[PDB]
Design a protein around this ligand. Sequence first.
Ligand SMILES: C#C[C@]1(O)CC[C@H]2[C@@H]3CCC4=CC(=O)CC[C@@H]4[C@H]3CC[C@@]21C
Length: 248
Amino acid sequence: QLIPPLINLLMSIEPDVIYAGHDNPDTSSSLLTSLNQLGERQLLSVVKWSKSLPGFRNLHIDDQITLIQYSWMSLMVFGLGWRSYKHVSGQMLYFAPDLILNEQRMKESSFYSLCLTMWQIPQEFVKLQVSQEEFLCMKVLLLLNTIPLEGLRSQTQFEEMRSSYIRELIKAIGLRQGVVSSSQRFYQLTKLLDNLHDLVKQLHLYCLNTFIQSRALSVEFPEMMSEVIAAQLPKILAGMVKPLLFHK
Ligand SMILES: C#C[C@]1(O)CC[C@H]2[C@@H]3CCC4=CC(=O)CC[C@@H]4[C@H]3CC[C@@]21C
């Protein structure tokens, strides 16, 4: 009625809750393994989600693959941010119902520092009071927020898709937001998206370091996650992609 049909569809295709399969006393290595196992399960969920996301299946299959490989980390941390905001008021990192971390569980300095970086998202969600409708449109824009330096095969269709979801984000903002306030809120949400490129860079570096050192660290990386990391992370970290920005 009052909620636009595409937003209602986005709510209906959200994945169901995903467990890490964590058994909970962790070591640094067991915790990292558990996080990678959860990552493997979420990656599957992302791909299934993509198959139902209006517009995405109409891009060339190579372009679909490329976009999933470029955005998976961003989608994972954005979803972590939503779940932390919804379930624990942004005050713990709710990776899964069986893997919720508070400060006590963040021993190693490097991992704590990474968690402080991830924590900026749920903090911003709390501050701006992001709604489920906003979040769902923002999440699609994230899937569509980086492309190859030479563009996609389906560039035209891609651009149309991105425009449609930007229009839908404006509808989402209009559900609660005035013409000026609604403009200012658009700015605020699209700047959050721009700022995620820098944030995810830290997560990409940490993951690739952990992956290269995995045998030494006694950390296991499952096959699907290992493939996305080997297929694109070094290239992404090297800057050999084109991040899309809403502001400059
Ligand atoms: C620890 C670690 C890392 O190597 C760096 C960021 C991490 C991720 C952060 C975002 C994330 C959120 C999830 O809810 C599933 C699990 C992943 C993470 C899996 C492990 C990663 C890739």
